[PDB]
Amino acid sequence: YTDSYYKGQTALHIAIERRNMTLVTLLVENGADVQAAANGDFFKKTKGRPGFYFGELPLSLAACTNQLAIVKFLLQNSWQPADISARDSVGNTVLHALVEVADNTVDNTKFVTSMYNEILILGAKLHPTLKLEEITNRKGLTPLALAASSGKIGVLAYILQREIHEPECRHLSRKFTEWAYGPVHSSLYDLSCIDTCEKNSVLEVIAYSSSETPNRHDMLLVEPLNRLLQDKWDRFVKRIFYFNFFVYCLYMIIFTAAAYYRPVEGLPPYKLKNTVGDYFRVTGEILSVSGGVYFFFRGIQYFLQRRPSLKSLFVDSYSEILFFVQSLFMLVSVVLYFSQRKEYVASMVFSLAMGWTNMLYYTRGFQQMGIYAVMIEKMILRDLCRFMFVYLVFLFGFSTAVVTLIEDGKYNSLYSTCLELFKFTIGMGDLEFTENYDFKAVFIILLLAYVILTYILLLNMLIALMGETVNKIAQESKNIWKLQRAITILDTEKSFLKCMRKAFRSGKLLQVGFTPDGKDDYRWCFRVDEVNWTTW
C-alpha cells in the first residue's frame, strides 16, 4: 500500500494476519521482504483513531498474535531469515512490542510471557553474543524499563523471576538457586537495572510513575522489589529518615518559638534590642527563613525533574505541593516584613499552620499511621469536597432566606447570618438568635428545615459515606504505604549529601561463571532464602 493509512502493508503481513502458514511459507520462498515495515497510520497507537500497533514488522506481528510457528519460521527460514534485533520507527524490537500488547489479563499475559521466553531462547540459539534485553527504543527504554513504566505487572513479574532450566540458556535467567538443603534453599535475584543503572532503574521508573500507570501500587509487591526495599530501609534509610523527621521537628519548634514571641509594635522591620531574648528571636527567624528557602528550592527541583503535565502536577505528589505552599507563605511573609507591612503576620501564621500539618507527611513509613494519613488525603479530595459543595449550597440558600426575612436587626447581613447558621453544624446553633422579624413561624420553619437537611441528614450521611470509602480503600492504602517507602528510599539514596557508596547493596556474587564465552558473570545479586515442604 502507498496510502498513508495502510502504508507498508504487503502480502506477508496479510498472510500472517490470516494465520495461513502455507501462504507465509510461499511468500518468503518467493522473496518477500521479511523486514518490510508496515508504518501506516492504521498500524500506530493513535488513540484518536482506530488501529493496531504491533511494531510494524512481520516477526513482531507473529509474536503479538501467538503464532509461534511463524516466528520460528521467520527467524530460521532458508531464503531470508528475519533480523531478531530489528527496530521499528519508534525503535521498538519484538520484545518491546510484546511488552506493549500486555494488559495484565491471564490469557494475554500467559502467552505474552511464554512468547517472550521463547524469543529469548531462540535469540540465544542464533546470536549468543546478542543481548536483546539491553536494546532501547527511541525513549531509551529497555523491555524491562518499558514494562515497569507502563505498569505491565504480569510481564514484569515474569522477567524479575525468570529462571531457565536448560544448558546454554542458564545465562538468560535472573533468578538462580545457589545452594539447596532439603525444604530450604537460597535463591539469588540478579538486580541489574533494578537497584541502579544509567537512566531507567526499575525502582526509579515505578516510584516516579505519572500516577496513571495501572498497577503502580501493585508492582512493588513483586518479591525481589519488596525485599530489596525492606533491606534498603533497614540498613541505610531508616536511621536517616528518623533523623530527617527529628530535624524537621526541631525546625517547627524553632519556627513556633520565633513566631510566638514576635514584637507587637507597628511598622516592621523591628530594631534589634541588645538583650538575650531578642538575639534568640532573630536567630530563630533566620533559621525559619532558611528552612523556607530550602523547601522552596526543593519544590522547584521536584517540578523540573519530574515535569508533571499540569494534571499529574496536582493529582499526585500532594505532599510536595503542600510543602511548596508552606515555603511560598514563608517567602511572602519575608517580603511583606521587609516591605514595612504588618500583613506579613497574616502570611506567617498560615505557613506555621501548614508546617505543623505537614508533620503528617512523616507518618508514612509507619504501617499503621501512614494508612491513616493516606485515607485523610483521599477523603479530602473526594468526599469532603462533594460534601462541602452540597453543604455550602444549603447553607447559602437558607442564609439568604433568613437574612431576607430579618429586617433592621443586629444580624441583618449575609456574613452574620451565614456564621450563625454555621454554628448549627458545630453543635452551637442558638435557634432563637434574633426576634427582629415578622412571621416567627416562617423563621422557625426555615431553621428547622435547615437543621434537618444539614445537621441530621447530611452529616450522618457523610459519616456513612466515609465508612463506605474506608471499607474500599484499606488495601489500596496498604500498597500506597509501600509505595511511599520506595519513594523515600530512592530520594534518600539519590540525595545522600556525602558521596556514600555503602547504599549499593547485595554484594557482587558470581552467578554461573560460564557466559556464552569462557568469561564469568558477576551481577550484584540479592539473596533470598525460602522454605518449601513439597517437591522434595
Ligand X SMILES: C=C(C)[C@]12C[C@@H](C)[C@@]34O[C@](Cc5ccccc5)(O[C@@H]1[C@@H]3C=C(COC(=O)Cc1ccc(O)c(OC)c1)C[C@]1(O)C(=O)C(C)=C[C@@H]41)O2
Binders in 225-284 for its own copies, by CB under 8 A:
256, 259-260, 262, 264
With respect to its own copies, which residue has the nearer C-beta, 236 or 251? 251
Task: Check residue 54 for interaction with its own copies (CB under 8 A).
Answer: yes
* Contact string (CB under 8 A) for its own copies, positions 91-110, x = contact: --------------------
- Residue 67 labeled ligand binder: no
* Contact string (CB under 8 A) for its own copies, positions 285-324, x = contact: ---------------------------x--xx--------
What whole-number distance in Å separates Cα of residue 18 and Cα of residue 12?
10
- Residue 216 labeled ligand binder: no
Least distance CB 323 / ligand XJ7 (angstroms): 7
From first CA to last CA, the distance across the chain in angstroms is: 59
Least distance CB 457 / ligand XJ7 (angstroms): 9
Task: Check residue 393 for interaction with its own copies (CB under 8 A).
Answer: yes
How wide is the angle at C-alpha 44 spanned by C-alphas 38 and 48, nearest 5°?
Answer: 145
- Tell me the torsion sign for CA atoms 288, 291, 297, 298: negative
How wide is the angle at C-alpha 180 spanned by C-alphas 174 and 184, nearest 5°?
Answer: 100
Task: Check residue 360 for interaction with ligand XJ7 (CB under 6 A).
Answer: yes
Report yes or no: 115 and 71 within 8 Å, Cβ to Cβ.
Answer: yes
Phi-psi group of 164: left, alpha or beta (phi > 0 → left; psi -120 to 50 → alpha; rest → beta): beta
Q: Which ranges constitute the DSSP H helices of 103-197?
A: 106-126, 143-150, 153-160
- Residue 8 labeled ligand binder: yes
Contacts of 192 (CB under 8 A, 6+ apart): 174, 523, 524
Alpha carbon of 329 to those of 283, 332, 353, 373: distances in Å? 19, 5, 10, 23
Coil vs helix vs strand at 292? helix
With respect to ligand X, which residue has the nearer C-beta, 452 or 461? 452
Touching its own copies, residues 435-494 (CB under 8 A): 438-439, 442, 446, 449, 451-453, 455-471, 474
Task: Check residue 357 for interaction with ligand X (CB under 6 A).
Answer: yes
Q: Is 475 exposed, middle or buried (0-12, 13-18, 19+ CB in 10 A)?
A: exposed
Least distance CB 317 / ligand X (angstroms): 9
Touching ligand X, residues 435-474 (CB under 6 A): 449, 452-453
Select the residue interacting with ligand X from 249, 335, 376, 431 (CB under 6 A). 376
Output the nine-digit C-alpha cell for 360. Answer: 503528617
Touching its own copies, residues 59-78 (CB under 8 A): 64-65
- Residue 18 labeled ligand binder: yes
Touching ligand XJ7, residues 13-72 (CB under 6 A): none
Edge-to-edge strand list for the sheet holding 526-531:
175-180, 184-189, 526-531
- Residue 427 labeled ligand binder: yes
Least distance CB 349 / ligand X (angstroms): 8
Touching its own copies, residues 160-199 (CB under 8 A): 181-184, 186
Report yes or no: 151 and 220 within 8 Å, Cβ to Cβ.
Answer: no
Least distance CB 354 / ligand XJ7 (angstroms): 5
- Residue 6 labeled ligand binder: yes
Touching ligand X, residues 288-327 (CB under 6 A): 318-319, 321-322, 325
The beta-strand segments (E) located in 374-518 are: none
Touching its own copies, residues 361-390 (CB under 8 A): 363, 368-369, 372-373, 375-376, 379-380, 382, 384, 386-390
Listing DSSP states for 4-33 in one string gives SSSTT--HHHHHHHTT-HHHHHHHHHTT--
Three-state secondary structure of 118-140: HHHHHHHHHCCCCCHHHCCCCCC
The beta-strand segments (E) located in 161-214 are: 175-180, 184-189
* Contact string (CB under 8 A) for its own copies, positions 2-31, x = contact: ---------------x--------------
With respect to ligand XJ7, which residue has the nearer C-beta, 121 or 313? 313
Phi, psi of 188 (to 5 degrees): -130, 125
Report yes or no: 211 and 204 within 8 Å, Cβ to Cβ.
Answer: no
Select the residue interacting with its own copies from 114, 290, 339, 404 (CB under 8 A). 404
Touching ligand XJ7, residues 361-420 (CB under 6 A): 361, 377, 380
Give the number of residues in contact with its own copies, rule: CB under 8 A.
106
Binding footprint of ligand XJ7 on the chain (CB under 6 A): 211, 316-319, 322, 353-354, 357-358, 360-361, 377, 380, 449
Binding site for ATP, residues?
A: 6-9, 17-18
- Binding residues for Na(+), by number, are 427
Per the annotation, where are the binding residues?
6-9, 17-18, 318-319, 357, 364, 427, 430
Residues that bind ligand X (CB under 6 A): 318-319, 321-322, 325, 350, 353-354, 357-358, 360-361, 373, 376-377, 449, 452-453
Annotated binding site for Ca(2+): 430
